[PDB]
Design a protein around this ligand. Structure first.
Ligand SMILES: [Mg+2]
Ligand SMILES: [Mg+2]
Ligand SMILES: [Mg+2]
Ligand SMILES: [Mg+2]
Ligand SMILES: [Mg+2]
Ligand SMILES: [Mg+2]
Ligand SMILES: [Mg+2]
Ligand SMILES: [Mg+2]
Ligand SMILES: [Mg+2]
Ligand SMILES: [Mg+2]
Ligand SMILES: [Mg+2]
Ligand SMILES: [Mg+2]
Ligand SMILES: [Mg+2]
Ligand SMILES: [Mg+2]
Ligand SMILES: [Zn+2]
Ligand SMILES: [Zn+2]
Lengths: 114, 55, 68, 100, 96
RNA sequence: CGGAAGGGCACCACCAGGAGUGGAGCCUGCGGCUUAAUUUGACCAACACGGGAAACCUCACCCGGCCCGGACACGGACAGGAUUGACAGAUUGAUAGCUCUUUCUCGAUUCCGUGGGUGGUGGUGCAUGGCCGUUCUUAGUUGGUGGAGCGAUUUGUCUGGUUAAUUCCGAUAACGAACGAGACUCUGGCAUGCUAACUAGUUACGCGACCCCGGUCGGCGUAACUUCUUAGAGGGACAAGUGGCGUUCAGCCACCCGAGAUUGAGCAAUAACAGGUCUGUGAUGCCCUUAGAUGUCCGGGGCUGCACGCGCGCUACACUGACUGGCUCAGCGUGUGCCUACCCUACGCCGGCAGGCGCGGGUAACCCGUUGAACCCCAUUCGUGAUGGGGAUCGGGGAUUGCAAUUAUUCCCCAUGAACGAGGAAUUCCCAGUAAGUGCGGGUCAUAAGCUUGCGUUGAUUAAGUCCCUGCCCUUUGUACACA
């Protein structure tokens, strides 16, 4: 690499990247029961896995919202066009995932029930 | 020329140069290892980054 | 909070009625004569005229001053 | 010819699995390979106050991140190197390839 | 905001060719990084897309220093009418 | 809960000690004074704390000046202009057309009033969340079944022994359990057994240099290996064995063999506080300002101001010392940044000096660097003198960084040469590679540690106990308290 950044700060930068992506999707997909993100980093290919519950809801109609999310990620982080691909997965037995149930409990709390 | 001196003061160093990438705060920051984040944010995102209190 | 010096009122830039008509001169025939000068600069080459002050001409687009 | 592949990882178990898989692949192809060396671990240590404000007893945290780097030397054509490296890779390990 | 007509057209055309556009929450930016062919300062970008959100055309999200704007169909038709475009053309977020 | 009683624990308590503090100067923080502000929170569990070592920014306070960065909706104002900018000349602090005369411009974005917003390190931590601190890192807590009681509840959760531990044994209307502790993870120890290594080495081999066959080389290359180095799977210690105390149970002492016969840290909980953070935030309710701004930007001041008191620290009060030369040994780490404009340094010249000038190495077990650190060790000078201890105050000069040092950023030289003769009342921390002495990394950084977080070197006396003091926990008792 021309920049040839050192590994000590390369790992830290990657971790900050994961935290920033995690919080961004937490704000975006709160209604969708978002639970976490797995990033599969490879040379020339970057597959990012979004673990949620309502995968159809988070995919949207004809994948419009996942498309614009891919464009958002590419523009914000400066990745080459087409290098990143977002995939949506459904977590089996989502009751055991605290984050998803916490989001559901938060939405139930704001709903108005006791 | 308002734009000639609206932000003409040099921001090449000092606390007002570097700011938290999450809070836009200029206090309790860490520039070591290129964190560029406040201590509160670092504690909040330590697990996400990879820092774990092994010892 | 109370003040002692009166506030500095904003500059009210006055309007001019048909200011375009003051650049040329009216003739009955199909000919054109230009009264004031025109800026020979690059960006404003042959369309933007210059100011006509009491002692010098000026163009604000490129900050060109022609003193006498 | 004298290819050298560098693997940096945060998890010891994953990195050892990856290096073991690569050397086993070299053994299957019957290629002369140097033993897996271990660079000294890099421990990025950060100490911060627990309290967001300044009150309370002075209590400090110890957040450390461990990075392990292992490199392997092999004697094979670059096409063989690309074939071996393109498969059986854990996502958490960063891979570097050097010809010299 | 005294946004020049050229900058407004540039913002609209980029928003119409790419359905989303990001911008850091930083007024003290010389020019926008995503589009640098023309000046179009980041302040103008922020205020223009703030206006689009205000009149119910675009949707805003925030991640620690940046805004993300998502253009709905009602904003698509408004942008098409403003730029004098046919209904056939669609932004990159619609077609495959 | 007690201003009652009995047990238990704790070097944030004591015994014996060690090093200190409080005694002097200085750095820093708090109160007070003063001031346009010398803003603010905190006042065991505030006081070198807000990672708060502030010339600019940070800054929230004050002295003055710009911008709207007042979206959107509604009614006017007109392509026979809505209205932005503008060097001259005055004014200012700045070439802010911010303002006053004078006109050229920009091209429906605007502007004028009204709803509606919007911003705020503004108030409210006595509304909050989260985090953190404290009780308390002591050891406490809760079901199931089963006995007692009409019931709320109680026994289990205990008379004693033992343990760092409600940790266990053991009597027992209790038996089985769960959280905690423990366990666990990381860390240091040692393995000539395993895996490996030209980004680490070792042993030999061959040259090169030097001294009287041999000796040295971090001088150069190569035949084996991982003992030394780095890092992976395992092993290894368990009160295992012996002699004693102890119902012969738990457990404790001494010892042989043994790398160890108590390495340190992390997480640490049914609960409570009206402890702190609204100044960490695009986490936030309400209130307030919102254009003559509590929003933002610019110039300057202040956060350091000094009759005084207090706290955390540095330097020392000297002969086990100071000064001058010689010799000699480490590990923790970091090092060219998204915006970001700022890296760590070998080498050769100039110069006493900080420092300046040139080509090189390093995104790193690769270069600084075998990190030639100090203490300490060796040899002279000083001779009990506030003395060559001491470096406060202060003058002159020389450099670095920064847009900018004045209230002297920091560094260097000459010189001036204060108190302090081991410190009262009172009081702090500690028990093994411990304290203490000493130096070195990271945080803050354009410039920078007299703080803190870690590391390395030398490295001890006391002591294997207690409730005397101080706290704090359990039990008994009392209650007219139960927002206790
Ligand atoms: Mg700050
Ligand atoms: Mg104790
Ligand atoms: Mg003070
Ligand atoms: Mg005071
Ligand atoms: Mg500032
Ligand atoms: Mg402030
Ligand atoms: Mg503004
Ligand atoms: Mg109203
Ligand atoms: Mg918000
Ligand atoms: Mg402002
Ligand atoms: Mg003296
Ligand atoms: Mg002086
Ligand atoms: Mg005391
Ligand atoms: Mg009574
Ligand atoms: Zn932050
Ligand atoms: Zn002109």
């Amino acid at each position: 690499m021309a920049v040839q950044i050192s590994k000590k700060r390369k790992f830290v930068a990657d971790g900050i990247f994961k935290a920033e992506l995690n919080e961004f999707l937490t704000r975006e997909l709160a209604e969708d029961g978002y639970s976490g993100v797995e990033v599969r980093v490879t040379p020339t290919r970057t597959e990012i896995i979004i673990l949620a519950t309502r995968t159809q809801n988070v995919l949207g109609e004809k994948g419009r919202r996942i498309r614009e999310l891919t464009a958002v990620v590419q523009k914000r982080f400066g990745f080459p066009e087409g290098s990143v691909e977002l995939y949506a997965e459904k977590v089996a037995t989502r009751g055991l995932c605290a984050i998803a149930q916490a989001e559901s409990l938060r939405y139930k709390l704001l709903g108005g029930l006791a | 020329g308002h734009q000639q001196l609206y932000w003409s003061h040099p921001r090449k160093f000092g606390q007002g140069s570097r700011s938290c990438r999450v809070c836009s705060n200029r206090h309790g920051l860490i520039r070591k290892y290129g964190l560029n984040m406040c201590r509160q944010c670092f504690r909040q995102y330590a697990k996400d980054i990879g820092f774990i209190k092994l010892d | 909070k109370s003040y002692t010096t009166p506030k500095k009122n904003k500059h009210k830039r006055k309007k001019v009625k048909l200011a375009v008509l003051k650049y040329y001169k009216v003739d009955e025939n199909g000919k054109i004569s230009r009264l004031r000068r025109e800026c020979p600069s690059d960006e404003c080459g042959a369309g933007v005229f210059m100011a006509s002050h009491f002692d010098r001409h000026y163009c604000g687009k490129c900050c060109l001053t022609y003193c006498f | 010819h004298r290819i050298r592949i560098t693997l940096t990882s945060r998890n010891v178990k994953s990195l050892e699995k990856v290096c073991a898989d690569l050397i086993r692949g070299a053994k299957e192809k019957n290629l002369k390979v140097k033993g897996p060396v271990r660079m000294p671990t890099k421990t990025l240590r950060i100490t911060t106050r627990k309290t967001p404000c300044g009150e309370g007893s002075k209590t400090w945290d110890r957040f450390q991140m461990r990075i392990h780097k292992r490199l392997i030397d092999l004697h094979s054509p670059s096409e063989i190197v690309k074939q071996i490296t393109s498969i059986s890779i854990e996502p958490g390990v960063e891979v570097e390839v050097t010809i010299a | 905001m005294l946004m020049p007509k050229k900058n407004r057209i540039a913002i609209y055309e980029l928003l119409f060719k790419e359905g989303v556009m990001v911008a850091k929450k930083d007024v003290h930016m010389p020019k926008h990084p995503e589009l640098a062919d023309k000046n179009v300062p980041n302040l103008h970008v922020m205020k223009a897309m703030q206006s689009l959100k205000s009149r119910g055309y675009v949707k805003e999200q925030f991640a620690w220093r940046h805004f993300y704007w998502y253009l709905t169909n009602e904003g698509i038709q408004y942008l098409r009418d403003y730029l004098h475009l046919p209904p056939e053309i669609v932004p990159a977020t619609l077609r495959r």
